[PDB]
Write a protein that binds this ligand. Structure first.
Ligand code: NA
Lengths: 305, 305
């Protein structure tokens, strides 16, 4: 037993990370088959970033202008194109370590692992959630752009995130692998506030089920609630609405523990109204919301890849 | 910016994980060059575990009793021996993906990454600290034995932990890679309880420095204290005494932030005596002690491997 924030093993993604240099800017790229994907803002000078026209900037670049390095071997660039906010550099060599993969656009509240890289080399791996306001709370420094987020499922890597920027508030913003930003953000140096964030209710409930599975039960009570009355309480604590879809997704955990979803909702209602009274849950003094129901089952059942 | 519990990239270790089966017991092994290392209790039956004579049990085994599988490839066992609580199975094929490595015995309060595996396949990666009572708070299920903990340093994987068991209290125990348990534990089914734990003071200070580096400053006060006056409070809150060596280890973080260690100690003293004033630090409502000073530097400087 035990319950930890757990990242996916990173080796399959490590084998895809390369370094991309344009001008004096170096960041990371993702090498799948004979394409390297990276943020298009690699083509911008500091001056360009103030007001970039990416089509015109890309017109002015040659293939030679992009230095791509896999470890210490140069990969010759033979084409360059743009898809939304992502640059695609066609190279003359397909990556023999390309895993089975998909590009997916994830939902707010869903989790993924980030392989933080610099100069094409991995620094570390950690688990992130896509916040309801479409930012992520990561750990990213200069040079981290092009690091990716991903899930693994039976040796298929589903890439869902590529890192582009840090907002002045200290949260992080990026795109899917088709280059569409998550949230209302743009790759130009202009004002772009993130919306007000909220707590991911279905994930908090999943984590309470994880706690029960690991023997923490003190917060269970004998109260009941309807979905509507629970949501009326949770709205006042800046929790996202819980829908019947969320109730159904919590079905397997509810079935294993014998605790009906709405009874766990009554427990959560009491936790919100009363606090923890100096107690902790799974070693935490806050209600945690970055585990999905599937993350609970995946950790507690030993799923491998 | 941002500060997360960050594991090492796991690919170098993933390439060393195998499955070892003896009788009807399956667990994981670590394949380095032509030797597979795994917990010796793999040779015990359920009746053996009650009172195992490991020397006798090993003499009664032959090479054919061990089935070793590296992914889809069966590895032929050509020798077997025992070093303390670790079994060493010599195989007729050397692992071509063996990283440059060392076996290290870590000190309490130091951290490492765990690659949790089942049936020789990686499930997830997460950071652990060796607690002062020589347990770790991990996430391990049936079949996780033989999963390893490690650090990566420049060009070398330093393996420091192999997983053997879960205490009835829900914490985890294991050995170094020479087969010596951390703490007073033994690989037999007899009563064993962890000693009372304590909080790793130098790590809490390191994490407060991480908070300052990331813009959290609310807990800083203009006060300073002495090492002795701080240790008076530390003893009252089950914190380890702070030594001059531990002050020295905090030197680089103190230097970067311009906050003397004893000033931060005055801040920590006020936090211990008065609480966290309804605030969080780096998203936590509790003081965190599982980041070493070097973990802070590694994450905040983007060290790669
Ligand atoms: Na101070």
């Amino acid at each position: 037993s035990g319950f930890r924030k757990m990242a996916f093993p990173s080796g399959k993604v490590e084998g895809c990370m390369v370094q991309v240099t344009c001008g004096t800017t170096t960041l990371n790229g993702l090498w799948l088959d004979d394409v390297v994907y990276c943020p298009r803002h690699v083509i911008c000078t500091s001056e360009d970033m103030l007001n970039p026209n990416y089509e015109d900037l890309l017109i002015r670049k040659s293939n030679h202008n992009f230095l791509v390095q896999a470890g210490n071997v140069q990969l010759r660039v033979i084409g360059h194109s743009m898809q939304n906010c992502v640059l695609k550099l066609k190279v003359d060599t397909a990556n023999p370590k390309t895993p089975k993969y998909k590009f997916v656009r994830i939902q707010p509240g869903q989790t993924f692992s980030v392989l933080a890289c610099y100069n094409g080399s991995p620094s570390g791996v950690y688990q992130c959630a896509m916040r309801p306001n479409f930012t992520i709370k990561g750990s990213f420094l200069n040079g981290s752009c092009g690091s990716v987020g991903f899930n693994i499922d039976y040796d298929c890597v589903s890439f869902c995130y590529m890192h582009h920027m840090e907002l002045p508030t200290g949260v992080h913003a990026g795109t899917d692998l088709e280059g569409n930003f998550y949230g209302p953000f743009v790759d130009r140096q202009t004002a772009q506030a993130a919306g007000t964030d909220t707590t991911i209710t279905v994930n908090v409930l999943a984590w309470l089920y994880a706690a029960v599975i690991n023997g923490d039960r003190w917060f269970l009570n004998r109260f009941t609630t309807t979905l509507n009355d629970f949501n009326l309480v949770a709205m006042k604590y800046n929790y996202e609405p819980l829908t019947q879809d969320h109730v159904d997704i919590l079905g397997p955990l509810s079935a294993q523990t014998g605790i009906a979803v709405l009874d766990m909702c009554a427990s959560l209602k009491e936790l919100l109204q009363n606090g923890m009274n100096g107690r902790t849950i799974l070693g935490s003094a806050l209600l945690e919301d970055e585990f999905t129901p599937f993350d609970v089952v995946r950790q507690c059942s030993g799923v491998t890849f």
